[PDB]
Amino acid sequence: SPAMNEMVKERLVLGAALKEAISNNQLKLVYQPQIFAETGELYGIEALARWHDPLHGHVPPSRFIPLAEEIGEIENIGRWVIAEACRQLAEWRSQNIHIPALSVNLSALHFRSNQLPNQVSDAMHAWGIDGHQLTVEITESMMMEHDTEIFKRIQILRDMGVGLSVDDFGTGFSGLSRLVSLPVTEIKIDKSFVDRCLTEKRILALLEAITSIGQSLNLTVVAEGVETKEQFEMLRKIHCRVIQGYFFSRPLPAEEIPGWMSSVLPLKI
């Protein structure tokens, strides 16, 4: 009972603290560099929420994203992330060409079908983003027909230069056959797939098959969740194109990014 009283108490203070966080704009945006395996040069970065508060603390995204879902703040957060990212690109535009591409995981931000054509376009209009600078990532579950009228929404963005990426495959050839009929520009590999891909058998051949589709259709296969050297060796051997994980660099905040790109690049191993 007092555990129950503590859960309600704690999930009521943080809820009000989350509303205050978006009101005065406390939220941050930490980026994680993804580079080429053979070249070592930077391919792009991914914008991550990473809320930080003096009282509560580090408050991981996996614990406030569902929390923001019950209080209806997924639109306020989602719109903000894109808007802040474009603002950060504008701040970086006043230096040089800098960033090649910037990725945003819409699925992780719990994006509904109503936000796509506007929250991306309006951020590209308020700032000098040429469109061929940012890419979006969806869970493919939204890709299916339904009745949400989302197929033309992503096509609007794709005509502006915005890249597209999918994540969930469900470990199935049907998911691969449904993928080749999709207007994608890059393909991401789940962390669970990369995790212990050396142990299991088919999962290594599966990842080797995904990379085969990439070279044939000019798709950029993206590795996500690489930690050890052994994972890099096997992936590079099967031509994984690009890598993203703790093995290269832990996600860095908005600041120190130019200092990182000028000191460690090219990171060729």
Side-chain angles (χ1 to χ4, degrees):
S1 182
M4 304 169 60
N5 294 126
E6 205 68 27
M7 292 187 307
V8 176
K9 172 182 175 299
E10 182 263 346
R11 291 301 168 184
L12 192 145
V13 176
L14 272 68
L18 207 161
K19 295 176 55 58
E20 183 70 18
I22 72 159
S23 183
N24 53 22
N25 243 315
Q26 289 176 220
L27 299 176
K28 281 297 184 178
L29 203 56
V30 172
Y31 310 97
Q32 183 177 14
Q34 48 190 359
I35 77 170
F36 302 96
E38 295 183 354
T39 306
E41 217 68 34
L42 184 63
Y43 167 75
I45 54 179
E46 186 182 1
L48 272 56
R50 336 300 273 191
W51 181 19
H52 226 345
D53 189 274
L55 289 82
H56 326 85
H58 305 271
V59 54
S62 71
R63 294 305 299 180
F64 73 75
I65 289 299
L67 179 61
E69 184 66 271
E70 294 182 291
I71 56 180
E73 303 292 350
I74 52 98
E75 291 191 356
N76 298 19
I77 294 181
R79 174 175 58 257
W80 177 84
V81 172
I82 308 178
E84 212 288 327
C86 294
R87 187 205 66 85
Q88 192 66 28
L89 287 178
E91 181 180 351
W92 290 341
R93 181 58 192 272
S94 60
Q95 322 296 336
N96 204 333
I97 49 181
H98 278 33
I99 311 299
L102 204 158
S103 300
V104 172
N105 198 328
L106 274 63
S107 174
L109 272 60
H110 288 3
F111 256 75
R112 265 61 184 90
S113 60
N114 310 119
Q115 305 149 295
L116 292 87
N118 300 120
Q119 296 186 357
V120 178
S121 301
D122 287 279
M124 293 162 51
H125 295 357
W127 310 100
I129 277 71
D130 199 30
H132 199 185
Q133 182 65 23
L134 57 92
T135 66
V136 292
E137 305 177 8
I138 52 189
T139 177
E140 185 263 7
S141 179
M142 291 173 290
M143 275 305 303
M144 296 299 101
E145 60 287 325
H146 312 332
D147 62 335
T148 63
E149 196 185 343
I150 193 182
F151 242 103
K152 53 188 297 182
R153 295 182 189 270
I154 63 169
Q155 276 290 343
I156 290 178
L157 303 179
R158 251 292 293 265
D159 295 333
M160 305 174 78
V162 179
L164 194 272
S165 179
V166 290
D167 301 330
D168 294 331
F169 307 106
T171 322
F173 165 72
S174 299
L176 273 62
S177 182
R178 287 175 297 180
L179 180 141
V180 299
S181 60
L182 254 48
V184 297
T185 62
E186 58 174 349
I187 308 176
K188 261 194 168 182
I189 303 182
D190 186 29
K191 301 179 180 179
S192 61
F193 290 157
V194 183
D195 179 87
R196 300 186 62 179
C197 63
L198 314 181
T199 302
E200 306 183 14
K201 201 60 179 180
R202 174 179 172 85
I203 196 177
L204 207 161
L206 174 59
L207 265 53
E208 189 177 1
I210 301 179
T211 57
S212 302
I213 310 300
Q215 301 185 15
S216 301
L217 305 181
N218 292 328
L219 298 179
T220 307
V221 181
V222 180
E224 175 185 355
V226 177
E227 298 176 349
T228 66
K229 178 183 178 60
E230 300 86 31
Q231 298 176 6
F232 174 78
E233 295 298 282
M234 186 65 61
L235 267 51
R236 184 183 179 182
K237 185 167 56 183
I238 62 181
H239 307 133
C240 196
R241 171 79 170 179
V242 305
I243 313 290
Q244 174 187 355
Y246 289 157
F247 179 76
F248 286 85
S249 62
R250 195 271 172 182
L252 301 178
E255 193 262 354
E256 102 188 342
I257 289 299
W260 189 87
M261 292 179 54
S262 60
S263 60
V264 83
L265 295 184
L267 205 157
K268 184 183 183 303
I269 173 182

